[PDB]
Amino acid sequence: NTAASLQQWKVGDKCSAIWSEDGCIYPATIASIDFKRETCVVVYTGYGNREEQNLSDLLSPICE
Ligand SMILES: C/N=C(\NC)NCCC[C@H](N)C(=O)O
């Protein structure tokens, strides 16, 4: 994980998010960010769902 940059993300960046449904970590890609709410919508890669997560709650992209 990239701890130092774990609050700032940009649209089009890959990440990991906590799926609200399993509570588990899954790979997701940032589709859009609302910097005012400090949240962003991410699309779960491989699944095709999109969920709104906090920028500071996002997790580093999977590479393994
Ligand atoms: C981010 N993860 C997912 N979707 C966006 N997973 C969908 C399949 C897993 C789900 N627990 C099931 O078995 O239905």
From Swiss-Prot:
Bridged cysteine pairs (disulfide): none
Residues with Phosphothreonine modification: 2
Annotated phenotype, changing residue 33 to F: In SMA1; abolishes the interaction with ELAVL4
Outcome of swapping residue 47 to D: Impairs binding to substrate containing dimethylated arginine
Tudor domain mapped to chain residues: 8-64
Tissue specificity of this protein: Expressed in a wide variety of tissues. Expressed at high levels in brain, kidney and liver, moderate levels in skeletal and cardiac muscle, and low levels in fibroblasts and lymphocytes. Also seen at high levels in spinal cord. Present in osteoclasts and mononuclear cells (at protein level).
Family: Belongs to the SMN family.
Domain notes: The Tudor domain mediates association with dimethylarginines, which are common in snRNP proteins.
Protein name listed in UniProt: Survival motor neuron protein
Organism (species): Homo sapiens (Human)
Covered residues, full protein: 84 to 147 of 294
